[PDB]
Design a protein around this ligand. Structure first.
Ligand SMILES: CC1(C)CC[C@H](C(=O)O)CN1C(=O)c1ncnc2[nH]ccc12
Length: 167
Protein backbone atom coordinates (compact mmCIF):
# COMPACT_ATOMS: atom_id res chain seq x y z
CA UNK A 1 0.00 0.00 0.00
CA UNK A 2 1.21 3.50 -0.91
CA UNK A 3 -0.14 7.05 -0.68
CA UNK A 4 -1.07 7.79 -4.39
CA UNK A 5 -4.80 8.65 -4.73
CA UNK A 6 -7.30 9.01 -7.59
CA UNK A 7 -5.30 7.13 -10.24
CA UNK A 8 -6.81 5.00 -12.97
CA UNK A 9 -5.10 1.60 -13.21
CA UNK A 10 -3.92 0.90 -16.78
CA UNK A 11 -1.92 -2.31 -16.18
CA UNK A 12 -0.49 -4.41 -13.38
CA UNK A 13 2.12 -1.70 -12.72
CA UNK A 14 1.10 1.53 -14.56
CA UNK A 15 -1.38 4.09 -13.13
CA UNK A 16 -2.47 7.48 -14.54
CA UNK A 17 -4.07 10.66 -13.16
CA UNK A 18 -4.96 14.13 -14.43
CA UNK A 19 -2.73 16.09 -12.08
CA UNK A 20 -0.07 18.75 -11.84
CA UNK A 21 3.09 16.77 -11.05
CA UNK A 22 4.35 19.65 -8.87
CA UNK A 23 1.21 19.62 -6.72
CA UNK A 24 1.15 15.83 -6.67
CA UNK A 25 4.75 15.73 -5.68
CA UNK A 26 4.29 18.29 -2.85
CA UNK A 27 1.36 16.31 -1.42
CA UNK A 28 2.61 12.82 -1.86
CA UNK A 29 6.43 13.43 -1.12
CA UNK A 30 7.17 10.34 -3.18
CA UNK A 31 10.51 8.57 -2.92
CA UNK A 32 11.17 9.41 -6.59
CA UNK A 33 9.78 12.11 -8.86
CA UNK A 34 10.87 11.94 -12.52
CA UNK A 35 11.90 15.11 -14.31
CA UNK A 36 11.58 15.46 -18.08
CA UNK A 37 15.15 16.72 -18.40
CA UNK A 38 17.46 17.72 -21.21
CA UNK A 39 21.11 16.65 -21.40
CA UNK A 40 22.29 19.96 -19.90
CA UNK A 41 19.84 19.83 -16.98
CA UNK A 42 18.73 23.33 -17.99
CA UNK A 43 15.28 23.37 -16.39
CA UNK A 44 13.76 26.20 -18.38
CA UNK A 45 10.23 25.12 -19.24
CA UNK A 46 7.74 22.32 -19.42
CA UNK A 47 7.77 19.87 -16.54
CA UNK A 48 11.40 20.72 -15.73
CA UNK A 49 10.79 24.45 -15.49
CA UNK A 50 7.78 23.83 -13.26
CA UNK A 51 9.59 21.39 -10.94
CA UNK A 52 12.55 23.72 -10.68
CA UNK A 53 10.38 26.76 -9.94
CA UNK A 54 8.70 24.82 -7.13
CA UNK A 55 12.16 24.24 -5.58
CA UNK A 56 12.90 28.00 -5.65
CA UNK A 57 15.69 27.24 -8.21
CA UNK A 58 17.53 24.86 -5.86
CA UNK A 59 17.11 22.08 -8.44
CA UNK A 60 18.90 24.25 -11.03
CA UNK A 61 21.74 25.13 -8.63
CA UNK A 62 22.31 21.45 -7.82
CA UNK A 63 22.04 20.53 -11.51
CA UNK A 64 24.63 23.11 -12.58
CA UNK A 65 27.10 21.65 -10.08
CA UNK A 66 26.33 18.14 -11.40
CA UNK A 67 27.02 19.18 -15.01
CA UNK A 68 30.18 21.09 -14.07
CA UNK A 69 31.52 17.87 -12.51
CA UNK A 70 30.16 15.19 -14.86
CA UNK A 71 29.29 16.80 -18.19
CA UNK A 72 26.01 16.36 -20.02
CA UNK A 73 23.77 13.33 -19.81
CA UNK A 74 23.12 11.07 -22.79
CA UNK A 75 19.83 11.22 -24.64
CA UNK A 76 18.06 8.19 -23.16
CA UNK A 77 20.07 8.53 -19.93
CA UNK A 78 19.40 9.74 -16.42
CA UNK A 79 20.88 10.79 -13.13
CA UNK A 80 19.58 10.73 -9.55
CA UNK A 81 19.72 14.03 -7.69
CA UNK A 82 17.87 15.49 -4.71
CA UNK A 83 14.10 15.82 -4.76
CA UNK A 84 14.39 19.00 -2.65
CA UNK A 85 10.98 19.93 -1.15
CA UNK A 86 9.22 17.71 -3.68
CA UNK A 87 10.40 14.14 -3.14
CA UNK A 88 13.37 12.29 -1.57
CA UNK A 89 14.98 11.97 -4.99
CA UNK A 90 14.54 13.37 -8.47
CA UNK A 91 15.34 11.03 -11.35
CA UNK A 92 16.26 13.35 -14.24
CA UNK A 93 15.51 11.38 -17.43
CA UNK A 94 16.33 12.63 -20.91
CA UNK A 95 13.77 11.54 -23.45
CA UNK A 96 14.42 12.39 -27.10
CA UNK A 97 13.28 15.89 -28.12
CA UNK A 98 11.54 15.61 -31.49
CA UNK A 99 11.91 19.37 -31.90
CA UNK A 100 15.69 18.73 -31.94
CA UNK A 101 15.49 15.79 -34.37
CA UNK A 102 16.41 13.12 -31.83
CA UNK A 103 15.66 9.46 -32.54
CA UNK A 104 12.32 8.42 -31.06
CA UNK A 105 13.63 4.87 -30.53
CA UNK A 106 15.70 6.30 -27.63
CA UNK A 107 12.38 6.72 -25.82
CA UNK A 108 12.48 3.05 -24.77
CA UNK A 109 16.01 3.51 -23.40
CA UNK A 110 14.78 6.56 -21.46
CA UNK A 111 11.94 4.62 -19.83
CA UNK A 112 14.33 1.76 -18.92
CA UNK A 113 15.81 4.09 -16.30
CA UNK A 114 12.53 3.83 -14.38
CA UNK A 115 13.18 0.11 -13.72
CA UNK A 116 15.95 1.02 -11.28
CA UNK A 117 13.28 2.38 -8.87
CA UNK A 118 10.50 0.39 -7.21
CA UNK A 119 7.94 3.23 -7.31
CA UNK A 120 7.96 6.54 -9.20
CA UNK A 121 5.87 9.60 -9.82
CA UNK A 122 6.48 10.62 -13.42
CA UNK A 123 5.37 12.56 -16.49
CA UNK A 124 5.08 11.01 -19.92
CA UNK A 125 8.59 11.17 -21.35
CA UNK A 126 9.11 13.17 -24.54
CA UNK A 127 5.56 14.60 -24.31
CA UNK A 128 4.69 18.28 -24.10
CA UNK A 129 7.40 20.57 -25.41
CA UNK A 130 9.58 17.56 -26.31
CA UNK A 131 7.29 17.03 -29.28
CA UNK A 132 6.49 13.31 -29.22
CA UNK A 133 3.01 11.82 -29.43
CA UNK A 134 1.89 11.25 -25.81
CA UNK A 135 -0.12 8.18 -26.87
CA UNK A 136 3.09 6.53 -28.32
CA UNK A 137 4.95 7.58 -25.19
CA UNK A 138 2.31 5.89 -23.01
CA UNK A 139 2.57 2.70 -25.08
CA UNK A 140 6.37 2.61 -24.70
CA UNK A 141 6.00 3.28 -20.97
CA UNK A 142 3.59 0.36 -20.52
CA UNK A 143 5.74 -1.96 -22.66
CA UNK A 144 9.05 -0.99 -20.96
CA UNK A 145 8.56 -0.08 -17.29
CA UNK A 146 8.10 -3.04 -14.94
CA UNK A 147 8.24 -1.12 -11.64
CA UNK A 148 5.26 0.79 -10.26
CA UNK A 149 4.78 4.07 -12.10
CA UNK A 150 2.21 6.77 -11.29
CA UNK A 151 1.84 9.00 -14.35
CA UNK A 152 0.70 12.60 -13.85
CA UNK A 153 -0.83 14.23 -16.94
CA UNK A 154 -1.32 17.99 -16.60
CA UNK A 155 -3.79 18.52 -19.45
CA UNK A 156 -7.28 17.17 -18.73
CA UNK A 157 -8.14 16.94 -22.43
CA UNK A 158 -4.98 14.95 -23.15
CA UNK A 159 -5.57 12.71 -20.23
CA UNK A 160 -9.11 11.78 -21.26
CA UNK A 161 -7.73 11.02 -24.73
CA UNK A 162 -4.90 8.86 -23.46
CA UNK A 163 -7.40 6.86 -21.35
CA UNK A 164 -10.03 6.48 -23.98
CA UNK A 165 -7.43 5.40 -26.69
CA UNK A 166 -5.51 3.02 -24.41
CA UNK A 167 -5.35 -0.63 -25.50
C1 LIG B 1 1.69 19.25 -21.48
C2 LIG B 1 2.61 18.04 -21.37
C3 LIG B 1 1.83 16.78 -21.69
C4 LIG B 1 3.83 18.13 -22.31
C5 LIG B 1 4.89 19.06 -21.88
C6 LIG B 1 5.29 18.93 -20.46
C7 LIG B 1 6.74 18.35 -20.44
O1 LIG B 1 6.98 17.28 -21.06
O2 LIG B 1 7.66 18.93 -19.80
C8 LIG B 1 4.45 17.95 -19.65
N1 LIG B 1 2.98 17.95 -19.92
C9 LIG B 1 1.97 17.84 -18.90
O3 LIG B 1 0.81 17.86 -19.18
C10 LIG B 1 2.33 17.79 -17.45
N2 LIG B 1 2.06 16.69 -16.77
C11 LIG B 1 2.34 16.68 -15.49
N3 LIG B 1 2.86 17.71 -14.88
C12 LIG B 1 3.14 18.85 -15.50
N4 LIG B 1 3.65 20.00 -15.08
C13 LIG B 1 3.75 20.85 -16.08
C14 LIG B 1 3.26 20.23 -17.22
C15 LIG B 1 2.87 18.93 -16.84
Amino acid sequence: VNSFSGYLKLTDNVYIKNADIVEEAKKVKPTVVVNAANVYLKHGGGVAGALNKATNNAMQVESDDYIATNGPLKVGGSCVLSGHNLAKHCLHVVGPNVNKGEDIQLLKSAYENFNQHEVLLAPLLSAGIFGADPIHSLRVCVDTVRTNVYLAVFDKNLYDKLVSSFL
